[model samples]
Target chain A: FRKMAFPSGKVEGCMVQVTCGTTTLNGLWLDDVVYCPRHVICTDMLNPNYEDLLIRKSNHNFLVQAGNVQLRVIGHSMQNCVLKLKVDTANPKTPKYKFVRIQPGQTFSVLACYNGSPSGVYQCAMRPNFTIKGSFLAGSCGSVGFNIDYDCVSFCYMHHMELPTGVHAGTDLEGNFYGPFVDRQTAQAAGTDTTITVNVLAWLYAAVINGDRWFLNRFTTTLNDFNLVAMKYNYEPLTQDHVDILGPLSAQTGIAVLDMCASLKELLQNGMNGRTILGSALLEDEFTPFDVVR
Target chain B: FRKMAFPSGKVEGCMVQVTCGTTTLNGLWLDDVVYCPRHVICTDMLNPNYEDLLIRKSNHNFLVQAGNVQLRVIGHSMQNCVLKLKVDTANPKTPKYKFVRIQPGQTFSVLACYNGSPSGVYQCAMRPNFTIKGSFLAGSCGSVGFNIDYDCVSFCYMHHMELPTGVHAGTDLEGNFYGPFVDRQTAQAAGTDTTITVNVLAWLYAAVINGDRWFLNRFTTTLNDFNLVAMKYNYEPLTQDHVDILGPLSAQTGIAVLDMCASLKELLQNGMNGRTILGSALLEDEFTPFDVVR
Candidate 1:
């Protein structure tokens, strides 16, 4: 029996070097399309160039993947040659191992001739709609940065800004007293307006960003919910310009706009200099041009 | 006894009809600053210029209001004049009666002699500061043309838009569901994110004035608090551009900028567009300019 062979070469954009029957890339006869072996099923067996003799067997099916790799046979006859599969391994994570040999010259279906050893998991996407140069890797936004600053955040609960002791007290699933130690996210029900942890994080974040002892004093002083709210709002929607006014402060911290506003609003609430901030915020919300309709 | 007359004429610049002691109407030769009688209390014998008389008769602290009124006599003498207080009947709502006639020529202190018949109530404001055009009778915003068409507003709260008898259910302070509503004035509330009702009003006001059914479906559907807010907002402070957009609407509604905004806000709260009947009430408050800044 005669053997069927595909001389090895680079397989990108279907520039795979090969001599097989009735097929170019993607199964077009001698068509100038990028070539691939899996689609070689169109090879007409009746034509001597693509005898169905090897592929007549059903179990073997494969599509060869890229990265310095190829396949060839070694031995005496169609009944006994070992099949050799080569691969690229620049990345330490890639595997390099030997596979079971094949019968020499046994008819190899272009469809079953190659498979396995893909580099990344994404190749699965290429099968249905792959066009030249059209498919590339893309990314998306990840989780927020809050969890990264746990220690700095943990310092906030050091004092409850309250009566019994400076540290926040706890009411267990029972009212069992506990110190200011607790996973606060779950500690306070999230839906609460005053205790929304984001605001808490934002408030403390503002203080620290402002200075060392700034928010520290706020936390240690009055026995209350810390001037978090008064620190940023007049309870009206913030206006665009007002929000813009907080730009510098936002740059100073994460919840940038929110925290700076906290400072201005608090200043106003406490009867300081931020009344304009409130006036503007109230007026601008509706007037801000950025969100207006034509 | 002699009569010290103000001579009766227009007060130009620092020059009143005639001068007395230390003052010139901010107000008059009077030393009392906490105004009275009408908006001011003129002294009698306390004035040394005409101290030679006896105003020691208590209970004459009367300050008369306006309308074809005057203090005169039959033959006409300051000390024995008959105080004729007249009235206007343009509207039956106005009262045209009341006054106290005085004895003439009794060394009348021009001060208390005619503490009656003044015009605008805010004239009390002119006392401490009046100069040049600063004292002009600034025309305040007058009647809004709601009689022009009530349909524009009466249509906002109709069709509860439900399968049943769609009246909004209630737990009142009355069907009084409190909303972002809230004077929030000092509630430190105005600076909040979600409930800034003023911006909501401003937003809706813009749409109607622009001739667009802003919250069209929103208005038509809800039986409760018509969808006024979803039509627009960040619930933040109004932006400058947004405030500018309302200028035309203010002009059109005759709710001068501040008055319209005031009423727009009040209307949203009261749910009635016609309320900003500017001719009367709002003027009393120190002109809270729409762009109030700290």
Candidate 2:
């Protein structure tokens, strides 16, 4: 009999050979067999951890889609075993995928094709041969599963782009991006200070909270100007005064507000709190779409 | 003051107005200015659905310990919330108790309790919260916590005693139980028949395949000696064939063998295959003092 070792775990196929007495048999008979023993081995050598089955994209709003996704199984020769990929889509009665089969040492990719809609937060499980007899006992079977988000890639990208550049590109003299648009002297004055100190904390806070309301309210009663409508302009400028004004406020307010917003969102989504407050307002006719301008 | 209804979508807490006026105060700042117009109102009615938190009793090995059990709080009213008590042990997260918390309208219970040793499997959880928050936009806050197995109750005794009379009491020849263990022979036989029928499944090939290997093997062997050990000296005449044969092979030997042993045990225990066949052996010599009787 040959021995195989797996790093994370191992899987086995149904087929196995047994050596009894002086003869090697393909199968064991119930009446004639003494005992058939099988083994699943794992080496201490760390195998590369398996990557998440799905990589999330940011544009997807961090929303995960339910479909078949490739899962990289990092290991050497695996054996016959069942792979149970369970996605904890924030539900209990029904898990995403129950028991799925993964061939031993085979880099097999299965579908996350859940019967229900994909949950933004989810976890996957791999249970090899949970049902088949001797699956758990044979020690010849094992499982390895993990969490995945289809939006992971996008999230990571956004995270990287938002990283601190540390280089002071200098502001327009008026503390504006491109010559202050109409005011050249103000732009020159804003750009006078080339040594821009990047407030790392404020940058991170804005990146996380995105200043949905606090930043939006800054321009609410003002003109819907071209610069204001720009995507990049949505973020408040990072001046010492701006940071001081909104820095601690954003941090404390961000945490509290984010938490509160999250809680409120949850309540509206659940619809268990009685009247559909937010839903009704959204369906109202007076809600005007913000003009999208360059 | 413009009174705008909050829609049930993504709304920044900083945008809400607890007390509306000509100018809207952001919800994020509501905590700072109690009566601010833009402050977001928080109530218990607008809470999100609770995610089912399943603490598998098997993981604790039926033992109680103290530590932080992480749970992801989903839905509204989760902020600044308290974990209410449904079933309490000694205290929350104490060594003697298993603390559990459930969300609103969620039902959970402790099916069993474990002593210091890992024998009894208990299902304990917090009671569901049914009260809704006043408004969806107004996030609610409350407590939801429970402690199970805190009192160190004997699960076996409780469960056994709680069984229906028809289930636990042995029937007489006339299917009646009046006094004690010897009062009704027929009733006793009927009870024995019921027990044997239920337990006989444990001897089946499927049972062996799905159950613990050592358990199956030892149990089978123990059943073989049942007549010799329990009825050998009985005055009533008994036949040898009337007892289960010691060496009759089942329909499926592989499955039967697996059933008799702990699925994970046999794979790693006796070195049946190669030393490195199964991933690794879990039980140490000190885990338990019981011998491999089979």
User: How high is the CA lDDT of each candidate model?
Assistant: 0.21, 0.19
Q: What does candidate 1's lDDT look like per residue over B105-176, in tens digits?
A: 011001111122111111000100110001111111010000001111100000000111111110111111
Model 1 bad stretches (over 4 Å): A1-262, A265-294, B1-39, B42-206, B211-213, B218-294
Q: Residue-wise lDDT of candidate 2 within A63-162, one digit each (tens)? A: 1112232122221221121111222232221212222222111111111111111101111111111111011111111111211122111000000000
lDDT of 2 at B80: 20
Location of the lowest summed lDDT over 10 successive residues in candidate 1 chain A: A139-148
Fnat, one value per model: 0.00, 0.00
Estimated TM-score for each candidate: 0.16, 0.17
- Highest DockQ against the true fold, candidate: 2
Report per-candidate DockQ: 0.01, 0.02
